[PDB]
From a paper:
Here we describe efficient routes starting from validated parallel and antiparallel peptide assemblies to design two families of α-helical barrel proteins with central channels that bind small molecules. Computational designs are seeded by the sequences and structures of defined de novo oligomeric barrel-forming peptides, and adjacent helices are connected by loop building. However, targets with parallel helices require longer connectors; namely, an outer layer of helix–turn–helix–turn–helix motifs that are packed onto the barrels.
We chose four protein sequences with <85% sequence identity, high pLDDT and low Rosetta energies for gene synthesis and expression in E. coli. The other protein, named sc-CC-7-LI because of its a = Leu and d = Ile core, was helical and fully resistant to heat denaturation as judged by circular dichroism spectroscopy, was monomeric according to AUC and bound dye, consistent with an accessible channel. The backbone RMSD values for the repeating helix–turn–helix–turn–helix motifs are ≤0.5 Å, which is expected given the low sequence variation in the loops and the hydrophobic cores of these buttressing helices. Finally, to test the robustness of the design to mutation, we substituted all 49 a (Leu) and d (Ile) sites of the central α-helical barrel for alternative design rules for parallel heptameric α-helical barrels (that is, a = Ile and = Val). This protein (sc-CC-7-IV) was highly expressed and was also folded, as shown by circular dichroism spectroscopy and SEC-SAXS, hyperstable, monomeric and bound the reporter dye. The success rate for making single-chain constructs from these initial five parallel designs was three soluble proteins (60%) and one new α-helical barrel crystal structure (20%).
Residue numbers in the entry: -1 to 23, 25 to 368
Amino acid sequence: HMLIAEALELIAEALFAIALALLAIKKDKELAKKAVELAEKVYKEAEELYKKAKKKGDLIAAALALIAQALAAIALALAAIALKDKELAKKAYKLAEEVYKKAEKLYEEAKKKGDLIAAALALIAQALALIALALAAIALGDKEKLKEVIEKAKEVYKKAEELYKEAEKKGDLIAAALALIAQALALIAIALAAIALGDEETLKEVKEKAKEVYEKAKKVAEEAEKKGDLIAAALALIAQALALIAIALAAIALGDEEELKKVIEEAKKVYEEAKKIYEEAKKKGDLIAAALALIAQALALIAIALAAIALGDEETLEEARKEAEEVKKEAEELAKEAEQKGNEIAAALAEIAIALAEIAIALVEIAKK
């Protein structure tokens, strides 16, 4: 359980570098270089953790190590846009390609052994790596690289759909929710690539397919709540928020103001539902499920922030910023309670919610002036 908690801490550190790169978009070159140095350090540390997890046979810890590697490449690509550095954008592209190739081998090994949870996490690392490739290709202006992102992301979407159906037939609702997370992240990679290419039809297909993921995640959350699995229910709410982020990105490029207003309404329902799961998880003592509920709250506020910025809704933007600070304070209290009871996994997951809430705050500051 120590290798899993170590990888989750590296995930939170990678998200901290993303917020640093997002804040540099203030237009500060030295701030963008500080986010670069943190991203390369997290990438190297997660590489050593991946080798240790593979040496011990912990496929779950090895997959989480690759997820931190993909988030480190995303921060490197975001710094490339702020610095206009094509040489550094090429390095982020190369590092993201190595994560995609490593996660592909791990997904095959986990599928043959029956570990559906580890296989779903490997697909999440592939989808996150494709987001880094899309951002790096945008900084380079490579139309050939943008088309490769769309083709690879379609393979991740198809692999996650087969894994979701297999997990649903076996009753593994945790792996089924993780498979829907990889689908929503893969659609985000396509949306970013289709925007730079100006593909209206592909953006229209992302919107309808993300709605299908949103409806499937609502069914998993209701089934997990009936069985008493609050961990799977919180993961299903995370997939709901990530699917709404993909719909917002597509509605932004297509100029669908009515769809953006529906995203805010739906994301508010996910945020309120995640608050009920948090109260139920804390009452029964499930600190891992409670931390995942705060993660779903932060992602739901990110979807609200993106839609309100494109709509110019300052009242809703101010509301999401206030709720983001409330999530950050609650996660700090949960981290103290988790370490007081020796639950290092929940303590690391609470740190991920803090970094996610800081990303939403950075998004609000980006639109201010």
